[PDB]
RNA sequence: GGAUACUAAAAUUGGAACGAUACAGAGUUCGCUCGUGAAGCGUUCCAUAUUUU
């Protein structure tokens, strides 16, 4: 599980840990986390090494008859049904020595047809862009061009769509079976009009931890192709975080968060009023995911950008975007939804509101963001979308932003001191780059030109 | 007949402690020598938190 690497390095593969010397190596074997990878490992390879592969069996027959059959050969721990096809199942023994007692006859049958059982082979244990971004960009017409075309290379496909259609009509039927008259509502970053590749598909169930661990074992045992369940309580709304193998994806199941369906019918009416806030929101993602300052963990997410890039229209002297006290306003007949103790209503149709009175084109604003949020403060002012100004928060500390729905998270709390240093000042490094004469104007045969510099693989 | 399941301590940040690595400084008998740091790390400990939109 080491392999050696040059400069006297060694890297282990089963943590995936890259040391630059020995000691180090050493001390990490000698550590609790190699241990419990060796322990759990070791399981794995104890269980595989005494299981079995059981398939012939003829359809619409469920693995119940074959545990009672297998338990005639001994103690039997486990019996695996297949998922995604339904056709085989793994026969996993209590110990080993009645493993043989399986190998002894292969005269099996089930309903009249003949089986096939094989000893399970043993898996090998697994451990638990700027290229192409700047290659279709710098051909444009100008910065505003650039960023039309980033959004049109950044919008999901049509496999993508269909792909993540697919897997909520799954969840859906599923827990249908399993919860009749229930609703899977997608959301996330596939409703809201802001969908990015490889993004993250949320799934809200419409009817304490006892659901959540209901839900993970329905995702771990019968769902098809989703292995890595997690489940998390330990949020202001508990989430299974689950990922889907056949597709190669991976998202969020919440029970409770109602409030984030209709975060993502905002999103999307926002980013439905002209072909702008698009453009501007996908711009100053790709940048804040390509400096180092949207990542995973304590790390400013994908919903904080957009939500900072609507205050920001909201704030412009000619209203972009107007605030959300407007919006509320705005509501008509059967939009009088509220979760979660406040109120929090907006039209659910586009064409009912006046265009902005904004004429900037792309590039001011962007740089015109710049500015503001390099010159705004960080310790104690906190961004108020639904008035749109600055001055109930629960926790903050050098960033401070709340929801304009759900004003109780503080959704700038996952962001430390020299994190938000950094932000500050690499959008000042941004607006001065902006105003200056090179970013301006467009480079033809080879400058990194208008938008690449900033969406360039920097450090 | 038709392809051999992701089972506990799932993560990162704030503070820490210890062990090493760095020498645009110099020498060497080729063993290292003098002193100074947090770049990358490893081990362990305490968590008014996040990681979903
Ligand atoms: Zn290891």
Redesign the pocket.
Same mark, same amino acid.
């Given at each position: 599980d080491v392999e050696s690497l040059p400069?006297?390095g060694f890297r %282990?593969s089963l %943590?995936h840990?890259?040391?630059? @010397?020995?000691?180090?190596? =050493?001390?990490?074997?000698? $550590?609790?986390? *190699?241990? *419990?990878?060796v !322990?759990?490992?070791?399981?794995?390879?104890?269980? $595989?090494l005494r299981?079995?592969?059981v #398939? $012939?069996?003829?359809?619409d027959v469920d693995s119940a008859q074959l545990s009672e059959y297998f338990l005639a050969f001994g103690p039997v721990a &486990?019996v695996?049904?297949?998922?995604?096809?339904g056709?085989?199942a793994?026969v !996993?023994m209590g110990d080993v020595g009645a493993r043989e007692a399986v190998l002894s006859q292969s005269q099996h049958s089930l309903g009249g *047809?003949?089986?096939?059982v094989?000893?399970? !082979?043993?898996?090998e244990?697994?451990?638990?862009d700027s290229h192409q971004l700047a290659k279709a960009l710098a051909e444009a017409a100008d910065v505003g061009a650039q960023m039309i075309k980033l959004v049109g290379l950044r919008e999901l496909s049509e496999a993508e769509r269909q792909l993540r259609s697919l897997v909520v009509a799954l969840m859906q039927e599923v827990f249908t079976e399993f919860f009749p008259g229930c609703v899977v509502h997608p959301?996330? #970053?596939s409703i @809201?009009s802001?969908d990015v590749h490889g %993004? =993250?598909?949320?799934l809200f169930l419409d009817l304490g931890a006892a659901m959540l661990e209901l839900v $993970?074992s329905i995702?771990?045992?019968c769902v098809?192709?989703? /292995?890595?369940?997690?489940?998390?309580? #330990?949020?202001?709304?508990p989430?299974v975080?689950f990922a889907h193998?056949?597709s190669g994806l991976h998202?969020?199941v919440?029970l409770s968060?109602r409030?984030?369906?209709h +975060?993502?019918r905002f999103?999307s009416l926002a980013s439905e009023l002209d072909g702008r806030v698009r453009p501007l929101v996908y711009t100053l993602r790709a940048w804040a995911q390509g400096r180092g300052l949207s990542? &995973?963990?304590?790390?400013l #997410? +994908? /919903?904080?950008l957009?939500l900072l890039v609507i205050y920001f229209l909201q704030t412009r002297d000619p209203p972009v975007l107007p605030t959300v006290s407007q919006l509320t306003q705005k509501a008509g007949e059967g939009e009088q939804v509220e979760v979660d103790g406040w109120d929090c209503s907006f039209p659910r149709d586009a064409s009912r509101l006046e265009p902005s009175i904004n004429v900037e084109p792309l590039s001011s604003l962007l740089a015109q963001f710049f500015s503001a949020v390099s010159s705004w403060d960080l310790r104690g002012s906190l961004l108020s979308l639904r008035e749109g100004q600055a001055l109930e928060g629960?926790?903050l500390?050098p960033l401070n932003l709340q929801?304009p729905?759900?004003l109780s *998270? @503080?959704?700038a709390? @996952?962001v430390? &001191?020299?994190?938000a240093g950094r932000l500050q000042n690499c959008c000042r490094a941004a607006a001065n780059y902006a105003r200056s004469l090179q970013y301006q104007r467009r480079s033809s045969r080879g400058r990194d030109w208008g938008l690449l510099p900033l969406l360039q693989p920097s450090s």
């Open positions: 400069r006297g %282990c %943590c840990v890259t040391t630059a @010397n020995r000691p180090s190596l =050493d001390a990490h074997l000698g $550590g609790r986390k *190699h241990r *419990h990878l !322990e759990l490992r070791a399981a794995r390879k104890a269980q $595989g299981s079995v592969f #398939s $012939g069996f003829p359809r &486990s695996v049904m297949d998922k995604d096809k056709v085989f793994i !996993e *047809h003949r089986l096939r094989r000893p399970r !082979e043993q898996k244990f697994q451990s638990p959301f996330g #970053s @809201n802001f %993004c =993250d598909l949320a $993970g995702l771990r045992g098809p192709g989703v /292995y890595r369940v997690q489940t998390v309580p #330990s949020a202001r709304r989430v975080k193998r056949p998202g969020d919440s968060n409030l984030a369906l +975060n993502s999103l990542g &995973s963990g304590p790390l #997410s +994908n /919903y904080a957009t629960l926790r500390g929801d729905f759900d *998270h @503080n959704v709390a @996952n430390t &001191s020299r994190v």
